[PDB]
Structure 1
Amino acid sequence: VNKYLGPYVMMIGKMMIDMMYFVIIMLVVLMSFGVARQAILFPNEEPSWKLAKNIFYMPYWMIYGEVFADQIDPPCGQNEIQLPPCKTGAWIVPAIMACYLLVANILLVNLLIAVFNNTFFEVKSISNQVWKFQRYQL
């Protein structure tokens, strides 16, 4: 009902579509990194639904400033007590983590910033006019 909050709310509703397209591309890159990390670091696994959870768990929180620094590259196959033998290709995981973090956090979030900023004026004018139209319905 407020003259500034109402257009803001329908403006948010307009940017949800661009957010959805960002979520689709984020989902592709996130599932690629999660599947690769889980399939490299855990070779001998039985069929269980925890694998699907481990696909999405840590790559999703990697977008919001939690990189899980204790699990990026833990010391392995070395006395700390000798650590477990390093899994084959375990060095690939920090490299693909670097590529994933770069692509996600730097490319796609800034691209969504770009699509939010360049479509702001049309969405703002349309939302203001639509709110002034819906005052009658209210």
Structure 2
Amino acid sequence: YYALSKNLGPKLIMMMEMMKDVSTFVFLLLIFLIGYGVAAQSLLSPDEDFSSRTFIGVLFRPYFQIYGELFLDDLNSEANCLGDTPFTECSRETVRMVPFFLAVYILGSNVLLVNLLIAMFNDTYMKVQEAAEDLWRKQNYELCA
């Protein structure tokens, strides 16, 4: 029922056009999310049998770290590092690579992919704004009928 409005309706048509760019962003992020997630989960727990908890561990924290919620306190607790500095005096030296991988990952996801999505939206918006307005004007009669 927002489609009847001259402000909300064309914008809804534009949102349906931008869904392909959303799909492009999802396909590019999925690559980095599963790569970093399998690597990070394996690095944190290298002596554990595979279970359903391993699979959730691969997708839970990697996905929510791209929205700014960084589980660094939780990662620090799981790495068994007892130092005051965050990843020093650990039992295994390999788990000290856990913040570096993370350091690459959020550079890939937040600084690169999100900003490219912004660029794709602006380009897509400028391209299909007039066509969306015309399509809304045909749908105005369709809704009236």
Query: Given the two structures, how large is their TM-score scaled by the length of structure 1?
Result: 0.88
C-alpha contact (below 8 Å) 1:41/1:87 kept by paired residues: no
2:33 corresponds, among 16, 19, 30, to: 30
Partner of 1:137: helix, strand, or coil? helix
User: How does the TM-score come out when normalised to structure 2?
Assistant: 0.84
* Number of positions where the alignment pairs a residue of Structure 1 with one of Structure 2: 134
Segments of 4+ in structure 1 off by > 6 A? none
Partner of 1:133: 138
Deviations 1:65-119 (A, max 9, x none): 10112034456266xxxxx962341111110100001111000000000000112
Once the two structures are aligned, what percentage of the paired residues are identical?
A: 38
Taking only aligned residues, the RMSD between alpha carbons, in angstroms, comes to 2.0
Choose which of 7, 11, 14 in structure 1 pairs with 2:10: 7
Give the counterpart letter for 1:115 in structure 2: M
Shift of 1:21: 0.7
Q: Which segment is superposed worse, 48-57 or 96-105?
A: 48-57
Which of 52, 61, 70 matches 2:73?
Answer: 70
| Alignment match of 1:59 (pick from 58, 62, 72) | 62
Stretches of structure 2 lacking an aligned partner (at least 5 in a row): 84-88
What is the distance in 2 between the residues matched to 1:54 and 1:108? 23
Whether the aligned pair in 2 keeps the contact of 1:40 and 1:87 (CA below 8 Å) is no
